[PDB]
Design a protein around this ligand. Structure first.
Ligand code: 7NJ
Length: 566
């Protein structure tokens, strides 16, 4: 934590609510939701654009009291019209910036945005699911401002969903109705709301795109894997993540007890007693203590979060994940909608912050055994097979006699993003109706325009395109500024929102109408492809073989003798 970005974060807090005020108009509007009417308000962007803004729409019953750790329940209608000109609070979480908990349990809301409430054409609807490891994030416009997308004639919807233990507690006992994935169930209920309500904002319920970055990307994929959402939407975009990323799910049924004990539970390990204690604890206490739940062994084996998406121990009405994500790929309805996937060109640069607090992590590259996929590794990671597997990884990333911080982050790009994408693509090809998947590689590097993640990762002054760097060209945030029409930043905003709107609209990301894309020929990946092709998005828009391919193949060779596990 740092006292300085504590003050000037809390200076642009003042000036993002004052800027918010100024950019509001007195033009208010009312729309008919399934649950009753809602009151919006037209707002302004620094590019003198304008959109109708509906924030605070509840899609679920506030999951408080006896509803805590439970699946969302559809909320309660209302005669008259609900206020929606202000946002609700975010899910309870730790503020990376201040170190203190903020947010509320009352957080199951979404926001709807569009430049025209009655177009005389039913528009494509884009649903954004934020990332944040399933433990942080919000749909607030200070991080996810719709200002750029509303230049396009679509309807943009940003959802929230329960985070951390309040979202992802999982208990084995079938009597307790806490199977897990409450946060994903929030997503599903929100999708259902959007399918049955977008029309009333000008959107075509037959043309809906779900997209997300990081945990939002894994969320999007879960929404494409689960049988709960069959047909709800028609295109998916996976931005730097998917459901079979190692960080994207965890078997956490045994950790509820640990959380309880950290919170001062007295008694033995019994799901009923543990749940009863947890049900009554303060929400801020659980969430703050979450950072202590993982054992040293779990951390060493690269378990990144204690609570997250999980394979549910018993099926119920609202079950979202009955089997392992890999197995769900086999019958996943979403394998048969237009899909786009991509990563930035230096993902693992995101880990500068964590490397600096723990430089000993670099020594892990001496053998790389800690990065061998856990399904393949032995528990102590001392088996000679494990050493061999780790040697393949080392050969892919360690470039001198001693590993460097950069070899580490390059490795991290693959462990956390490229290799799981490869596994998904290949697993998908063996269970797909044959609908195209397009790859992008975001490779546009700038420090003129940024987003708050750069502060967390302390990538201020560091070159390369980190994980989350691309958000900047998609969403307004409080650190953003009006950029010159002819700036490389402004042009990238146009290209990104353009490509994304084009893909949403048509299920094909190519458009001759996008600046820089004239000679692009964006072909999707085929099962027969030995080398992945992607649109490299830089100052130049360029189709290239994925540079990361050789390393991807090298990781793949760890499975030479365990092909069934790949
Ligand atoms: B994303 O910001 O949800 C994300 C974050 C981390 Br710390 C990792 C390992 C993957 C994706």
């Amino acid at each position: 934590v740092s006292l300085m970005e504590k003050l000037k974060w809390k200076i642009k807090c003042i000036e993002n609510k004052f800027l918010n005020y100024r950019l509001t108009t007195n033009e208010t509007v009312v729309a008919e939701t399934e649950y009753g009417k809602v009151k919006g308000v037209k707002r302004l962007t620094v590019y003198d654009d304008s959109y109708y803004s509906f924030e605070g729409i509840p899609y679920a019953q506030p999951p408080v009291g006896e509803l805590r750790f439970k699946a969302p329940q559809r909320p309660t209608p209302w005669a008259g019209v609900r206020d929606c000109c202000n946002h609700k609070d975010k899910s309870v979480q730790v503020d990376f910036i201040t170190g203190k908990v903020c947010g509320s349990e009352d957080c199951l809301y979404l926001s709807v945005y569009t430049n025209n409430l009655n177009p005389e054409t039913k528009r494509p609807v884009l649903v954004y699911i934020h990332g944040g490891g399933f433990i942080i994030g919000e749909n607030h416009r200070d991080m996810y401002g719709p200002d750029y997308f509303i230049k396009k004639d679509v309807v943009l919807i940003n959802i929230q969903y329960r985070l951390g233990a309040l979202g992802f507690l999982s208990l084995n006992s079938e009597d307790l109705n806490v199977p897990g994935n409450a946060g994903l169930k929030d997503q599903v209920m929100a999708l259902r709301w959007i399918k049955n309500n977008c029309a009333n904002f000008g959107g075509n319920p037959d043309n809906i795109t779900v997209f997300g970055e990081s945990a939002g990307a894994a969320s999007t994929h879960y929404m494409m894997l689960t049988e709960q959402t069959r047909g709800l939407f028609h295109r998916g975009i996976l931005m730097s993540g998917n459901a079979i990323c190692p960080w994207a799910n965890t078997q956490c049924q045994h950790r509820a007890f640990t959380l309880a004990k950290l919170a001062g539970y007295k008694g033995e390990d019994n799901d009923k007693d543990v749940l009863e204690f947890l049900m009554k604890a303060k929400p801020q206490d659980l969430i703050k203590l979450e950072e202590k739940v993982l054992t040293l062994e779990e951390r060493t084996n690269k378990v990144m979060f204690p609570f997250g998406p999980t394979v549910e121990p018993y099926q119920t009405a609202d079950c979202v994940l009955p089997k392992h994500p890999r197995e769900m790929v086999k019958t996943a309805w979403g394998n048969s909608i237009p899909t786009m996937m991509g990563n930035t060109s230096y993902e693992g640069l995101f880990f500068t912050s964590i490397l600096k607090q723990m430089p000993l992590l670099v020594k892990e590259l001496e053998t790389c055994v800690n990065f061998v996929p856990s399904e393949l590794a032995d528990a102590e990671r001392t088996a000679p097979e494990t050493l061999e597997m780790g040697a393949k990884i080392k050969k892919a990333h360690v470039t001198g006699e001693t590993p460097t911080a950069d070899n580490f982050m390059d490795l991290c790009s693959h462990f956390y993003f490229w290799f799981p994408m490869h596994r998904l693509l290949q697993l998908r090809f063996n269970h797909t109706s044959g609908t195209p998947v397009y790859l992008y590689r975001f490779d546009f590097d700038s420090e003129d325009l940024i987003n708050p993640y750069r502060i967390m990762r302390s990538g201020r002054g560091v070159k390369g395109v980190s994980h989350t760097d691309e958000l900047t060209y998609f969403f307004w945030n409080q650190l953003a500024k009006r950029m010159p029409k002819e700036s490389r930043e402004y042009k990238t905003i146009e290209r990104m929102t353009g490509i994304w709107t084009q893909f949403a609209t048509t299920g094909n990301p190519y458009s001759n109408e996008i600046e820089g894309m004239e000679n692009v020929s964006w072909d999707p990946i085929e099962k027969s492809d030995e080398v992945y092709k992607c649109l490299n998005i830089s100052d130049e828009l360029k189709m290239i073989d994925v540079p990361e391919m050789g390393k991807i193949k090298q990781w793949e060779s760890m499975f030479e003798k365990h092909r069934d596990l790949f």
